Symmetry: C5
Subunit: 275 residues, 5 copies
C-alpha cells in the first residue's frame, strides 16, 4: 500500500447555518505521497496547474480523488496544482471549499459547544493500496481567533481510523476497508449576544407577569395578562429562525413556555378565585 | 438481456423541505453486471476514476446511465469509478446526490409517517437488453438513527417491477417496457417539537377564551376577545412556513380555526345576549 | 422541409411561484423525424447516451436544438438519448426541466384558473427546413391528479402555428418564419385553503366591527376600533407574500381595504356624532 | 476596423428587485458583421448550433465576445447559433439572459420612473478593430405592454458612443477606446397598488390621530395614542421590504415619520397642557 | 523571479450583506508581465479570447492563476483575454467577480466605517518565480461615487507584502514565501437612513415611557407600560435582520435594551411604591 502524508490548512470557518445543520469551511489540502521516479525537465520540480493535470491523468499518472464524507453538495475546488519531484514524491495541493455537516446537538443553546469535523476518505481505493500515514492540521490562521459567535479554542485534534464499509462487501469480498481521516475542531458558542438580547427581556416579561400578579383590578388584570400573551406571541418569531427544527427543548423555548405557563397560571388563579 | 445486480448505500438523509415537497438523500450506487471478458493489465483489477471513463465509453465500452425518476433537477454525481474485472464482471460505483420527491400526504401533521422512495430506472435501455436482477439496500448508516425530526424505523423495503411507458409506444412498437426499481424507506415524524412548542400554547389560548367566557364586563369582554383575535392572528405566521400549501386541513390549522370559531362564538354569544 | 413528429410527456408540475410569475414543469421530450438512411451496427437500433452524441454532431449528424420560449433561465436537461434507426427515422428523447412563464392574470385570486403553456420553437431553423408535423401530449401522469392547489382538469390542448419574427427580417429577407408549438394545460386554483383560512376570519373581523358599532362607550369605542386597526394591520403581512405585486385589486386585498373602510366609517361616524 | 450591425430583441422584462438594485431582461442578440468570404457546403447558408462553434473558433474563425457591462453575475446564454453566408456576412444570433443594474433613484417611490439600460461593449477588441455601426432595437414584444408594475411607454432609445477606459492605458498606450452601446427603455412604476393599499390606510391612521385629538379623557387619550404608536409600528415591516436600503427619504417613509410626528405632537401637547 | 505588473480596475461594489459577512466587488484584472519573445502573426499583437487560451496553455505557454484569498466560493470569471506582444510582454486581462470577506467590526453600527479588501496571491508559484512588482488601482469608476449606504471616500490604498505560509513548510523546506497583494478601499456607512427611520422613533418610545411616568392611574400605568413592552417587542424583528449575529452590543440594540430597562424601571418603581 502506498502511504499518503496528508496535511490540511484551514483558512476560514464561516456560515454555520444551524437551521438546516451545516457549516462551511474554507482552506487548502496537501497530499504528499511517494511514487515511481521520473525524468522531469531539468532539476527544477515540475508544476502543473488547474485544467492541465487531466492530460497527465490520461497519460497514465495516478492521483487519488480524496473526497469528503460529511460534505453536502459537491465541494467546489478552485485552483489545484500537482508537484512532480524527480526522485519520486508527488504533492497534490488543492483549494477545497464545501458545506460540511455534524450531528451537532443543541442541548444548551446559548451555552453551546460542538466539534467541527472534516471526515476525509479515499473514494476509489481501499486500505490495500492507499493508507493514510499521518496528518498534521496546520491551522494557524484560525487556531486562536474570534469568528462569528464561534470561538475556536484549542488545537484541532486528528484521528486516523480504518472504517469498514459493508455495502461493498457483496462486490468486494475481503478488500472493503478504508483508511478514514477525521479531524475535530473544538468550537464554542459565544453567549454574549443571546444573554444581552433575548434572555434578559424575557426576564423583564416575567417581571411584568409579577406586576400583573400585583395588579388590583380583576377585569384589568385579565386585559393586561392578555396583553402579556400578545407580548410572548411577539416572541418565537424572530427567535424561531435562530434555533433549528429540533425535537427536544432548548433553554430559550423553555423560557418561552415558562412565560406562557406563568401567564396561564396567573389567569387560572384569578379566574378560580373569582369563581 | 444483460442482468444488473444493483445495490444502493444510503449515507445521509437530510433537508426534508415539506414546503415545496422534496427531500435530499445522499449515498452510493453500485451496479454490478457481467459482460464480455477482456485482457486487463496484469491480474490486478483495473480502476478508472472520474473524467477518464469517457475515454473508455468512446473506445466502445458499454455502461448504463442509471437515472432516477422521482428526482428534481440533475442529480449531481461527485466522484465515480468503474471496475473492470478480467473474467467479465463490471462494477459501476458512483456517489449520487439529488433532491427526491414523494406524494407524501400530511393528513396528520405532527403524528406523521411517510415513505422515502428512490425510483430508479434505466434511461436508455428497455427490458429486452437490461433487466435488474436484484437489489439489496445496505443502509446500515441510517437504519436505526435519529435524523432531524424523521426517525428511520425498520429496514428499507425494495421492489423490482416492469413498468411500461406508453409515450415510447408510437416509436417503439413492442419493446417499450422498463425494469424499474423502487426502494421504500419508512420514516416517521418526531412529534415532540410540535407537541412541546405549538399545540399546548394553543390550548392555553383556548383556556384564555374560557377565561373571557368567565369575564364580568361586557365592553371589557369585547376588548379582551379582540385581543384574543390579535393572539390567534399572531399564529399561522411562523406556523404557515412549516406546513405546505395543502388543500385539505391538518390538525394544526384545524386548531387555529377552532380557536377562531370559539372566539367568534364567544363574541356572537355576548352580542346576542346584549341585544 | 424535414417534418418533425414531436410528443411531450409531462411528468410533474410543481412550484407555481405566483409571486414572481413562474412555474416549473418536469417531463420528457420526444422528437421523431426522418432523415438519410445509414448503416447501423447490426439490425438492432443504435443507442447513444448523454455526452456522446456530441461526437456524432461533430461527425456530421444533424439534430435540432428544440428550445423553449416561455422558459426563464437555461432549461437544465438531464440525461438525453438519440435513436438511430437504420431505415431513416431518428428519435431525440431528452428529459427537460425548466421554469416556465405565462401572463397568468389573478382577477379572482381564490376562484382562479389559468393555462400552463410550454411554447416550443426551433432555435436555429425556420419553416423552410424544419416544420413541426404534429404533436400529441401523452400527459397521462398528471391528466387527472390533485397537485398542490392546482387541479389539472381536462386534457392538454395543443397548437401548431407559424410565428413570424421581424428581428431576423433585416438579416434574412424572406425566410424568417418559424413553426411554433404551444401546448395549453388548463389549471384551476383549489380555493379550499383560502376559504378556510383567510376569508372567513376576515368576516369575523367585520363582525367585530359590527360589535364595536353596537358598543356603548364612546372613548372605549375608539379604543376598540383602534384595536381593530391593529387587527387588520396584522393582516396583509402573511397575506402579502401569497399574492404577487399586482397593479389592480384581487378580492383578498379588496376585503382588507373594505375592512379598513368599514373601520374608518365607524370612527368617522362616532366622531361626527360626538361633534 | 470591421463594422458590426447589432440588433437586440427584447423578449420579457421581469423581476425588478429594487431591494438590491437589479432587474432581469430576457431576449435575443443579433450581431451581423462582414468578413472574409468562404466556400460553404452548397449555396445554402451554413448553420452551426451550440457547443459546435467552438470547433470553428479553434479552426481559426473570428467571433466577438459581446459582453454586457451593467450585468451582475455571468449572463447565462442558452442556445446560440452562428450563420456563415458564402459571400462574407456572419450573423451571431444568441439568447442572452442576465440580471442588469441601473443607478435607479427612488425620489418619488409610487410616482416613479426610470430607464432600463443594457450597456453593451466588446470585451476583447477596441475601436481600432471592432466599431459598432448601428443598432435597431426591435422590441415589439414589450413595446406597449403591461408588465408587473412597470408600464413600458415609448420606444427603446439607443446610443452609440466611444468610451475610453484608462485602466488599459498603462498596457495599451494609444489604443484603449471602446465602441460602447447603451440602450434605454423608459419604464414607469404603476402607482395603483401603493395608492390602493399603503397610502390611504395611513391617511386613516392620521384621521384616527385626529380622533384622539378629539378625545375627552386624558389618561384614555394617552392609552389610545400609545395604541396609535402600536399601529404605526405595525407599519414599516411589510413596508420595509418593498423600498430599498436608501439614504434619503421617499414619500412612504415620510408619511410614516409624519404619522409618528403627529402622534408625538399630540402626546407632547396633552402632557404640556396637563402640566 | 519573473516580475508581474498588476493593475486592478474596480467597476462596481454592491451587495454588502453584513448579516453573513460578505461583499461583492465587480471589475477587471490586468496582469502585465514579461516573458520569452515569440513570433506572432504579423506585427499586430495576437489576441486570444475565452475558451481558446487553454490550447496555448497545453501548447506550453505559462500563465499564472492569480487567485483571491478573501473570496468565498469560486470567483466566476466571465470573458478573459491574453495579449501576446512579439517582443516579450504578456497581458492577462480578465473580468473577475466574487464575494469577498473582511473582519469588518460593527462597534458603531450607523456611524460605521470599514475597509474593503481584495487580498490577491499567486496560487501555484512562490516568491522565487513570481514576485509582484507594483500595483496601481485605477478605480476611477467608484473613486468618488454614492453607492448604496457605502460612500467611497479617498483613493484605494495598496500594499505589497511577502506572506509566509507554514503549511507548505513540511513539503517545501525553504521556498514557501508568497508575494501577496492587499488593496484597501475605505468605505463609510451613510447613517441617514438609520437616523431617519430607526433611532428617532425609539426616542419617541422613550418619550412615551416618560409619559407613562407622568401617568396618574396605577393599574392604567401598568396597562400602558405593558403596551410599551409590546411596542419594544415590535422592534428587534425588522431590526434584527439588518445587524449581524454579533457577540458584543451595537448602539441600536443598546437603545432597545435601554428602552427595556427604562420600562422595567418604571414598573418596578410603581410596584415598589404601591407595596
Amino acid at each position: 500500500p502506498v502511504d499518503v502524508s496528508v496535511s490540511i490548512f484551514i483558512n476560514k470557518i464561516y456560515g454555520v447555518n444551524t437551521l438546516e445543520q451545516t457549516y462551511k469551511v474554507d482552506g487548502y489540502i496537501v497530499a504528499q505521497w511517494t511514487g515511481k521516479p521520473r525524468k522531469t525537465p531539468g532539476d527544477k520540480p515540475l508544476i502543473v496547474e488547474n485544467t492541465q493535470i487531466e492530460r497527465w491523468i490520461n497519460n497514465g499518472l495516478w492521483v487519488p480523488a480524496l473526497e469528503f464524507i460529511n460534505v453536502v453538495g459537491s465541494p467546489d475546488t478552485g485552483n489545484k496544482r500537482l508537484m512532480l519531484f524527480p526522485d519520486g514524491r508527488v504533492i497534490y495541493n488543492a483549494r477545497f471549499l464545501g458545506s460540511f455537516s455534524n450531528d451537532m446537538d443543541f442541548r444548551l443553546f446559548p451555552f453551546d459547544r460542538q466539534q467541527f469535523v472534516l471526515e476525509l476518505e479515499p473514494f476509489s481505493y481501499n486500505n490495500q493500496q492507499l493508507r493514510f500515514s499521518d496528518i498534521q492540521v496546520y491551522t494557524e490562521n484560525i487556531d486562536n481567533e474570534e469568528i462569528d459567535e464561534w470561538w475556536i479554542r484549542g488545537k484541532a485534534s486528528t484521528h486516523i481510523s480504518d472504517i469498514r464499509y459493508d455495502h461493498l462487501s457483496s462486490v468486494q469480498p475481503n478488500q472493503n476497508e478504508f483508511s478514514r481521516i477525521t479531524v475535530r475542531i473544538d468550537a464554542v458558542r459565544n453567549p454574549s449576544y443571546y444573554l444581552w438580547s433575548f434572555i434578559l427581556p424575557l426576564g423583564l416579561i416575567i417581571a411584568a407577569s409579577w406586576s400583573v400578579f400585583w395588579l388590583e383590578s380583576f377585569s384589568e388584570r385579565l386585559q393586561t395578562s392578555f396583553t402579556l400573551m400578545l407580548t410572548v406571541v411577539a416572541y418565537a418569531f424572530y427567535t424561531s429562525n435562530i434555533l433549528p427544527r429540533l425535537p427536544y427543548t432548548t433553554v430559550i423555548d423553555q423560557m418561552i413556555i415558562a412565560g406562557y405557563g406563568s401567564i396561564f397560571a396567573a389567569i387560572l388563579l384569578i379566574i378560580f378565585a373569582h369563581h
